[PDB]
Amino acid sequence: QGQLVQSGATTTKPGSSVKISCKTSGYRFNFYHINWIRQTAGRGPEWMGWISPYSGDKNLAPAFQDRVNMTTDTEVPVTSFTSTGAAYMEIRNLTSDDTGTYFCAKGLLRDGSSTWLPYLWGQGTLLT
Amino acid sequence: FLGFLGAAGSTMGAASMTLTVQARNLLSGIVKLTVWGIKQLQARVLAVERYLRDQQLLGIWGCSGKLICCTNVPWNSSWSNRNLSEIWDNMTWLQWDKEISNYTQIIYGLLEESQNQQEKNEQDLLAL
Amino acid sequence: QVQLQESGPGLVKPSETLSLTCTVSGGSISNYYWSWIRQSPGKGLEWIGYISDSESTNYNPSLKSRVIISVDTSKNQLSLKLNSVTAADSAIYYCARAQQGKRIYGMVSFGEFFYYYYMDVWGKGTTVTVSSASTKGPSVFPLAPSGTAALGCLVKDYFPEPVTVSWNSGALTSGVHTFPAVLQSSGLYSLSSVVTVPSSSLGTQTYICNVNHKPSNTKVDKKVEP
Amino acid sequence: SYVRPLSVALGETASISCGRQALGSRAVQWYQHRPGQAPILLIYNNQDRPSGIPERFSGTPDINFGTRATLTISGVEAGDEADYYCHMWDSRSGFSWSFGGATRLTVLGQPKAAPSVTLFPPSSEELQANKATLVCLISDFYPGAVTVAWKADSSPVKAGVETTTPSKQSNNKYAASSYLSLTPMQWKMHKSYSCQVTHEGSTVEKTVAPT
Amino acid sequence: ENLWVTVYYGVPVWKDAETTLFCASDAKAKHNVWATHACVPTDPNPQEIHLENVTEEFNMWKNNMVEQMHTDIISLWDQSLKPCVKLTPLCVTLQCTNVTNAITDDMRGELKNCSFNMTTELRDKKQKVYSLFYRLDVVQINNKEYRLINCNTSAITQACPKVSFEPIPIHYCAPAGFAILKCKDKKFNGTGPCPSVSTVQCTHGIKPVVSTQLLLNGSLAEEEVMIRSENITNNAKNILVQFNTPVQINCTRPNNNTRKSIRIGPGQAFYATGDIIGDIRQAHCNVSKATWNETLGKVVKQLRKHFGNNTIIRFANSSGGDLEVTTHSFNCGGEFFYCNTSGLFNSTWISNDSITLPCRIKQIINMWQRIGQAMYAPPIQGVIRCVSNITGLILTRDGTETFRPGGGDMRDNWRSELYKYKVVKIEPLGVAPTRCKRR
Amino acid sequence: VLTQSASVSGSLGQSVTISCTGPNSVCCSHKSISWYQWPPGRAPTLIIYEDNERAPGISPRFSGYKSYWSAYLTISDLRPEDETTYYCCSYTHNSGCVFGTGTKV
Ligand SMILES: *[C@@H]1O[C@H](CO)[C@@H](O[C@@H]2O[C@H](CO)[C@@H](O[C@@H]3O[C@H](CO[C@H]4O[C@H](CO[C@H]5O[C@H](CO)[C@@H](O)[C@H](O)[C@@H]5O[C@H]5O[C@H](CO)[C@@H](O)[C@H](O)[C@@H]5O)[C@@H](O)[C@H](O[C@H]5O[C@H](CO)[C@@H](O)[C@H](O)[C@@H]5O)[C@@H]4O)[C@@H](O)[C@H](O[C@H]4O[C@H](CO)[C@@H](O)[C@H](O)[C@@H]4O[C@H]4O[C@H](CO)[C@@H](O)[C@H](O)[C@@H]4O[C@H]4O[C@H](CO)[C@@H](O)[C@H](O)[C@@H]4O)[C@@H]3O)[C@H](O)[C@H]2NC(C)=O)[C@H](O)[C@H]1NC(C)=O
Ligand SMILES: *[C@@H]1O[C@H](CO)[C@@H](O[C@@H]2O[C@H](CO)[C@@H](O[C@@H]3O[C@H](CO[C@H]4O[C@H](CO)[C@@H](O)[C@H](O[C@H]5O[C@H](CO)[C@@H](O)[C@H](O)[C@@H]5O)[C@@H]4O)[C@@H](O)[C@H](O[C@H]4O[C@H](CO)[C@@H](O)[C@H](O)[C@@H]4O)[C@@H]3O)[C@H](O)[C@H]2NC(C)=O)[C@H](O)[C@H]1NC(C)=O
Ligand SMILES: *[C@@H]1O[C@H](CO)[C@@H](O[C@@H]2O[C@H](CO)[C@@H](O[C@@H]3O[C@H](CO)[C@@H](O)[C@H](O)[C@@H]3O)[C@H](O)[C@H]2NC(C)=O)[C@H](O)[C@H]1NC(C)=O
Ligand SMILES: *[C@@H]1O[C@H](CO)[C@@H](O[C@@H]2O[C@H](CO)[C@@H](O[C@@H]3O[C@H](CO)[C@@H](O)[C@H](O)[C@@H]3O)[C@H](O)[C@H]2NC(C)=O)[C@H](O)[C@H]1NC(C)=O
Ligand SMILES: *[C@@H]1O[C@H](CO)[C@@H](O[C@@H]2O[C@H](CO)[C@@H](O)[C@H](O)[C@H]2NC(C)=O)[C@H](O)[C@H]1NC(C)=O
Ligand SMILES: *[C@@H]1O[C@H](CO)[C@@H](O[C@@H]2O[C@H](CO)[C@@H](O)[C@H](O)[C@H]2NC(C)=O)[C@H](O)[C@H]1NC(C)=O
Ligand SMILES: *[C@@H]1O[C@H](CO)[C@@H](O[C@@H]2O[C@H](CO)[C@@H](O)[C@H](O)[C@H]2NC(C)=O)[C@H](O)[C@H]1NC(C)=O
Ligand SMILES: *[C@@H]1O[C@H](CO)[C@@H](O[C@@H]2O[C@H](CO)[C@@H](O)[C@H](O)[C@H]2NC(C)=O)[C@H](O)[C@H]1NC(C)=O
Ligand SMILES: O=C(c1ccsc1)N1CCN(C(=O)C2(c3cccc(Cl)c3)CC2)CC1
Ligand SMILES: *[C@@H]1O[C@H](CO)[C@@H](O)[C@H](O)[C@H]1NC(C)=O
Ligand SMILES: *[C@@H]1O[C@H](CO)[C@@H](O)[C@H](O)[C@H]1NC(C)=O
Ligand SMILES: *[C@@H]1O[C@H](CO)[C@@H](O)[C@H](O)[C@H]1NC(C)=O
Ligand SMILES: *[C@@H]1O[C@H](CO)[C@@H](O)[C@H](O)[C@H]1NC(C)=O
Ligand SMILES: *[C@@H]1O[C@H](CO)[C@@H](O)[C@H](O)[C@H]1NC(C)=O
Ligand SMILES: *[C@@H]1O[C@H](CO)[C@@H](O)[C@H](O)[C@H]1NC(C)=O
Ligand SMILES: *[C@@H]1O[C@H](CO)[C@@H](O)[C@H](O)[C@H]1NC(C)=O
Ligand SMILES: *[C@@H]1O[C@H](CO)[C@@H](O)[C@H](O)[C@H]1NC(C)=O
Ligand SMILES: *[C@@H]1O[C@H](CO)[C@@H](O)[C@H](O)[C@H]1NC(C)=O
Ligand SMILES: *[C@@H]1O[C@H](CO)[C@@H](O)[C@H](O)[C@H]1NC(C)=O
Ligand SMILES: *[C@@H]1O[C@H](CO)[C@@H](O)[C@H](O)[C@H]1NC(C)=O
C-alpha cells in the first residue's frame, strides 16, 4: 500500500518562501526516496529532486540548485514494516512564474536501476 | 560483511549473497547433573535436532550441500503474483516469509516428488 | 574559684535521721550537679547519690531506701538526710561537684550514647560517729618545756573525733605537730599537739593553746611556761 | 571493697590496671585518694585530665575496642602513695555506682629516716586531778613502723600504755604517739620513767623523772 | 517469465519462540549458590551484530527469559541447600533473655540471648547451649520461653557456610539455531516496535540480585529515567522505575558478631551467634539526601507524562503486607537486612546531610513461593558493610495520585534487566521464484 | 528537449503508439525510458519503467519498446479511461527524470 497526503492549497505573492508537507503511511518511510515534481501551466512537468529518508542524501535538478531546500524528519515505527514520516520542501528566490500544482512521490524500489523513480504519488497542492 | 543476520533488513537479492554467514552459525557457538548441566545438554541436542530436520528436506529435494539450488516445480502465481524486481530488489526475506507463509507446506510437497521422480528418470536413462 | 564546705553533727544515735549540709562558695548551686560520697573504715569510697542542675534526684540502690538529698538555692546550701542510722553508717561524708559527660559511641539519633558523671571539686569532708554513747568535752592540760625546745598540750578524754587545735589563736603555725588521737579502752579519744620553738623565746612570748571540740560545744584554751 | 597492693620503685613508672574490663566503648575516671583526705580527680574522660594535675599522670584513650584502661604514673614519688580508683563506665553495662576496688600504691626505695622521740612528764594540774599521764611523741621516721617500750626505772611496764599506729605526715614520713597512764603515787614513788622506741634495727630512749 | 521455485538455505529470517537458555560466566577461580562454576566461560569478545534496517516488536511482560530465569534461581537455591545440615533438632523450647541492656527502651528485645538443650554427637547425651537470636526469628509461647519462627510452618536448613550469596554476573545464551535480539532504543518503553535492533549470542552480565522496593546494582538508563508497566492506567500493575544516575546507598551492621560452632551430631555442626564484641549498635543504611531528592525529582517528571502536568502526585510508605514486602529487603555481606523505607517516600510534589534508614536483621529467611521450606543463614562474623547503587524502583499507584513501593515477586527483579532481550529461532530455509531451472 | 508525439487517438478495440525521442543527451540507448499516465492536474500513474517493464497491476494491454533512437508506448485495445495525457521519462540510476513534452490521446 502506502499513501502520501500533502499540505493545504494556499497561495502567496512573489518574493516569499512556502513549505509543503508530505505525510507517509502504510510503508517503511526509510526504504524509498521521496521525490517532488511540479506541473507548471506554462511548462512541461519538471522533476525537482529526491532525497533519501535514510541516508539523508539529496539530489536536485540544476534548475533548482541554489533555490530549494528539501528535508525529512525521522520515522515513527508503527509495525515491523509500517512507519509514519514527513517530507518538507521550500523555494527561496520565488516569484509567480513558479505557479502550479505540486506533488510528492516515493521511489519505486529500494535497489536496482530504477530505485528513486517516482512511483506512489500524493494528492497535489494548488499554489499561487 | 555485516555479520550473522546482518542483512536481515536488506533486500532478498542482497541477503542471498551472504548465505554462508548464516549457514555456519547453525550448529556452533559455545553450547554433571547440575541445573546448568541439564540445561546446557538439552541445548546441545536441540541444535543438532533442528539442523538435521532442515538438512533432511534439503536432501529430499535434491539439494544436499548447496545454499542455492534451482528446482523443476513451476511458480504457481497464486502463491505470489509479485514480479522479480518487485521481490529481489524490494522485499526482505522476513516480510517475504510472512506473505508466502501458507504455501510453504504446499511447495515443500511438489519439491519432494519432483525429486523422487527425477531420481526415477535418471535410473531409467542409466539403464541403456 | 569554687570551694566546698561540709557541716555535720559528729554524733547521731542508732535509729535516727542523720542530717548534713554543704555550702558552695564562688559559683551557683542550681547550675551544676552535686554528689555525696562517704568513706567508712575499711570499706572503699561509696557513692551515695547526686542531684541534677534542675534538681532531679537519683540514689544508689545500696541505700536508696533511707536517703533523701535536697537543695536550697536561696543560698548555695545542699543537704543530705539519712534515716535509720546504724553503726556501719559512721564515715567521713564528702560532697562534690558532679559534671555530666556524654559519651557517644554510635548514632545520637538512635540514642547510642550514655551519660557518665565525675566529681571534679570536693569538700574537705565531715566526720560523723554512730554511737549511743554520749558526747563529752576534753580536758586540755599544759605540757611545759624545759638548740631548740618543745612544748605542747595534752587534750585528754574526749568523744568523738575531731578536735581542732591551733597555737596563738592562729598566729603560731610553724613547727606545730598535732598528733593523731588515741582511743583509750574507756572509749574516748585523747590527743596531743606540740610545737618546736627556739629556746630563747621562752621569756616571755606567751604560747596559748586553742582546743575546739564542737560535738560537745566546748571551746577551751590554755597557756604553757616552765 | 577489697584492696589490691602495688609496689613500684621511686623514679620508675607505675602502671595501674583497671580491675574491671569494659564490654564496650568506655568513659573511665581515675581518682587519687589518701585515707582521711578528699579524693582528687586525676583523669575524667579516658584521657582528659583537669588542671592542676601534672603530665606524669596519663590514661589510655578509647580509640579501638580491646585496649585496657590503665593509669600510668611516670616518675613516681613518695607523694603518689594513695588508693587509686577506676570509675569504669561503658556502653553495655548500666550505671556505675561503685568506684570499684582500690589499688594501694606503695612507692619503694624511700630513704630511711630516724625518729624524733620527745617525752613529757605529767603536768601539775593533771597531778592535781589525781591522774598522771606521760606522753611519748615519735615523729619523722621512715619506714612507718616503731616499737615502743616503757620502763619504770629498770623494770618494764605495759599496763597503762596506749600507743598509736603510725600515720603519714605531710613530710611523707610517719608519726606516732603513746600514753603511759598511771596513778600520781607510782609517779613520785618511782625513780624515773623512760620511753624506749625501737625503729628498724636501732633502739632510742628518752627518760624523765619527777623533779 | 518461466518462474520456478528456488530453494535457499541460510536466509535471514527468524520467528519468536521459547527455548532452554544456558548460562555463561566469567573466570574468577569459592563457590556461590548460583553454581556459576558450572557455567561455560564467556568469550572476552562478546560479538554483537547490528541488524541494519530491522525493527522488531518487544514485550517484556510476555517475555519468557524472565519466567525461565526465575525458575533457574529457585532450582539453584534448592540445589545448594540440598546437602547442608538440617536444623530440625533446633526446633526445641528456648529459654531466652534480653542481651545487655541500659539503652533505648524497646530495642533491648530486638536481639535475645537464648539457652536450650540440644543433641550432641552421642545419641544418649544432651548439651545445654546458648545462642544469640534476633527478634524476628523467634516467637513467644506464654514466661521467658521462645521458639523459632518456622517450627510450626516449615522445616529449617542452614546454608553450608562456604557458599557465598554475593551475586555475580550471569550471561544467558541461546542454543545454536537460535539468537538473542537486543533492543538498543534508549527511549524504549518495554513494548512495541523497537527501531534499533541487534543480535547477540548471550546477554550481558546479569547479577541475580534479589532486593525489594529499591533495585540494587542494576543496569542504568542511558538517558532520561524510563517508567515501565503493562497497564499504567491499571493501579494493580507495578511500575518499574529505572534511573540513569545511580544513587549510592551505604548499609552496615556494626555489631561485631562471633560464630560458635556447636556439634549438633555426628558430622553435623550448627553455627550459632556466640557473642557481640564491643558496642551493640543499630543496623542502618544511608543515602545522600541531596541525590535521593534530585533523582526522585526526575521520577515525578516522567510520572507526569502519564498523569498530567497540573496533577499532583505524592510518595508514601508501604501500605502493609508481609515483612519482605513492606521493607527494602536485601542481602548485604551475608545477612538479610530489612530496612524501613518511610524516610525515602514521604514527599508530595506540586505542579511546578543524608537520611538514615533503620534496618532489622533476620536469619530465618523462608521461600516466597511455597511455604514449607525455610533457610537458616549462618551468622557472619565481623562487621558488615556493603555499598551499593540504587538503579531503579518498584512503585504502586492507588487509584492527586499516591505512589507507595513494594513487590515481593522475584521475577520483577529480572524484568528490570531482561527487558532489552528477546529469544527467536532461525529458519534458514527459504523458497522464492526465479528464472533458473534444474538440468 | 525530449520530444514525444504531437497528438494521436484511436477507437475502442484498436491501438495507439506514442513516440519519444531526443538528442544524445536525453536519449536513448544509454538511458532508461519510463512512461507515466497523467490526468491534467491530478495524481499521475507509472505504467512502464526501464524501457518495457510495467509497474505492478498495469494491464498487459500497455507495452513499451525502445529503438536505438526513440522509445515507443503501445496502448492496445483502448478503453474509455485512456483519454489522458502521457509523458515519457529519461533517467539513469544516479540522476533525475527528464520528462517529455506531452501526448494527449
Ligand atoms: C551514616 O549516617 C550516620 C549518621 O550521620 C553515621 O553515624 C555516625 O557514626 C560515627 C561513627 O560510627 C559517629 O561518630 C562518633 O562521633 C562521636 C561524637 O563526636 C562529636 O562530639 C565530640 C564531643 O563533643 C563534645 O566535646 C566537644 C569538644 O571536644 C564540644 O565542642 C561538644 O560541644 C561536646 O561538648 C559539649 O557537649 C557534651 C554533651 O552535650 C557535654 O558533655 C560537654 O560537657 C560539652 O557541654 C566532638 O569532639 C567531635 O568533633 C570531632 O569531629 C568533628 C566532626 O564532627 C571534627 O571537626 C573533629 O575531628 C572533631 O575532633 C564530634 O563533633 C565521637 O565521640 C566518636 O568517636 C569516639 O568514639 C569512638 C567509639 O567509642 C572511638 O573509637 C573514637 O576514637 C572516639 O573516641 C575518642 O573520643 C572519646 C570522647 O572524647 C574518648 O573517650 C576516646 O578516648 C577518644 O579520645 C581520643 O580521640 C579524641 C578525638 O577523637 C581526642 O580528643 C582525645 O584526646 C583522644 O586522643 C565517633 O567519632 C557519629 O556520631 C554518627 N553520626 C551521628 C549523627 O551520630 C554513619 O557513620 C554513616 N555512615 C555509615 C553508616 O556507613
Ligand atoms: C537499508 O535501507 C536503505 C533504504 O532502502 C538502503 O538504502 C538504499 O540502498 C540502495 C542499494 O544499496 C540504493 O540504491 C542505489 O542508489 C544509487 C543512487 O545513489 C547514487 O547517486 C547519488 C546521487 O548522485 C550519490 O550521492 C551516491 O554517491 C555516494 O553518496 C551517498 C551520500 O550519502 C552515499 O551514501 C552513497 O553510498 C554513495 O557512496 C550514489 O552513488 C545507485 O547508484 C545504485 O545503482 C547502482 O547499483 C544497482 C544495484 O545496487 C545497479 O543495479 C545499478 O545499475 C547501479 O550500478 C542503486 O540504485 C538506494 O539509493 C538506497 N537508499 C534509499 C532506497 O533510500 C540500504 O542499502 C539498506 N542497508 C542495509 C544494510 O540493509
Ligand atoms: C548469654 O547467657 C549466658 C547464660 O546462659 C551467659 O553465660 C554466662 O555468663 C557469665 C557472665 O560472663 C559467666 O560467668 C563468668 O564466668 C567467668 C569464668 O568462670 C568468670 O571469670 C566471671 O567472673 C563470670 O563469673 C558464666 O560462666 C556464663 N555461663 C555460660 C554457660 O556461658 C552469656 O554471657 C550470655 N551472653 C550474652 C552475649 O549475653
Ligand atoms: C553491589 O555491588 C558491590 C560491588 O560489586 C557490592 O559490594 C561488595 O560487597 C561484598 C560484601 O559486602 C564485599 O565482599 C567483602 O569484601 C571485603 C573487602 O575488605 C572483605 O573484607 C569481606 O570479607 C568480603 O569479602 C565486596 O568486596 C564488595 N565489592 C566491592 C567492589 O566493594 C555490593 O554488596 C552489591 N550490593 C548488593 C546489595 O549486593
Ligand atoms: C531548510 O529549512 C530548514 C527549516 O526547518 C532548516 O533547518 C533549520 O535551519 C536553521 C537555520 O540554520 C537551523 O538553526 C536549525 O537548526 C535547522 N533545523 C531545524 C530542525 O530547525 C535548514 O537549515 C534548511 N536547509 C539548509 C541547507 O540550511
Ligand atoms: C554505580 O554507578 C556508577 C556509575 O554508573 C559506577 O561507576 C562506573 O562503573 C563502571 C563499571 O566499573 C565504569 O565503567 C565507569 O567508568 C564508572 N564510572 C564512574 C564515574 O565511576 C559504579 O561502578 C556503580 N557501582 C555499583 C556497585 O554498581
Ligand atoms: C571483632 O572482634 C574480633 C575478636 O572478637 C577482633 O579480632 C582481633 O583483631 C585484631 C586485629 O588487630 C587481632 O590482633 C586480634 O588477635 C583479634 N582477636 C581475635 C580474638 O580475633 C576484631 O578486630 C574485631 N573487629 C572490629 C572491626 O572491631
Ligand atoms: C559511602 O561510603 C563510601 C566509602 O566508604 C563513600 O565514598 C567516599 O567518599 C569520599 C568523599 O569524602 C571520597 O573521598 C572517597 O574516595 C569515597 N570512597 C570510595 C571508595 O569511593 C561515600 O561517600 C559514602 N556515601 C554515603 C551516602 O554514605
Ligand atoms: O536472597 C533472597 C532474599 C533477599 C532479600 S530477602 C530474601 N531470597 C529471595 C527470597 N527467597 C526465595 O524465595 C527463594 C528460596 C529458594 C530456596 C529455599 C528458600 Cl527457603 C527460599 C526462591 C529463592 C530466599 C532467597
Ligand atoms: C495452482 O494451485 C491451485 C491449488 O493450489 C491449483 O488448483 C492450480 O491448478 C495451480 N495452477 C497451476 C498453473 O499449477
Ligand atoms: C515492495 O514490497 C512492499 C511490501 O508489501 C509492497 O507494499 C510494495 O508495493 C513493493 N514495491 C513495489 C514497487 O511493488
Ligand atoms: C526486653 O526488654 C524489654 C524492654 O526493657 C522488655 O519489655 C522485655 O520484656 C524484655 N525481654 C526479656 C526476655 O527480658
Ligand atoms: C534442659 O532439660 C532440663 C531437664 O533436666 C530442664 O530442667 C532445663 O530447663 C532444660 N533446658 C532449658 C534451656 O530449657
Ligand atoms: C505459626 O505461628 C505464628 C505465631 O504468630 C502464627 O502467626 C502463624 O500463623 C503460625 N502458622 C500456622 C501455619 O499456623
Ligand atoms: C509504551 O510505549 C509505546 C511506544 O509508542 C506506546 O505505543 C505504548 O502505548 C506505551 N505503553 C505504556 C503502557 O506506556
Ligand atoms: C487498563 O486498566 C483499565 C482499568 O484499570 C481498563 O479499563 C483497561 O482496559 C486496561 N487496559 C487494557 C489494555 O486492558
Ligand atoms: C507538559 O510539559 C511538557 C514540558 O516538557 C510539555 O512538552 C507538554 O506538552 C506539557 N503537557 C501538558 C498537558 O501540559
Ligand atoms: C508508614 O508511615 C506511618 C506514619 O508514620 C507509620 O505509622 C507506619 O508504621 C509506616 N509503615 C511502614 C510499613 O513503615
Ligand atoms: C518506619 O519508620 C517510621 C518513622 O521513621 C515509624 O513510625 C514506623 O513505625 C516504621 N515502620 C515499621 C514497620 O517499624
Ligand atoms: C515525613 O515528612 C514529614 C513532613 O515533612 C516529617 O515531619 C516527617 O519527619 C517525615 N518522616 C520521615 C520518616 O522522614
UniProtKB/TrEMBL annotation, chain B:
It is found in: Virion membrane; Host cell membrane; Host endosome membrane. Residues 12-128 form the Retroviral envelope protein GP41-like domain. This is Transmembrane protein gp41. Residues 98-128 form a coiled coil. The chain holds residues 516 to 660 of 860 of the full protein. The gene is env. It is a single-pass type I membrane protein. Disulfide bonds join C63-C69. Glycans are attached at N76, N83, N90, N102. The chain crosses the membrane at residues 1-17. Residues 1-14 are annotated as: Fusion peptide. Residues 39-57 are annotated as: Immunosuppression.
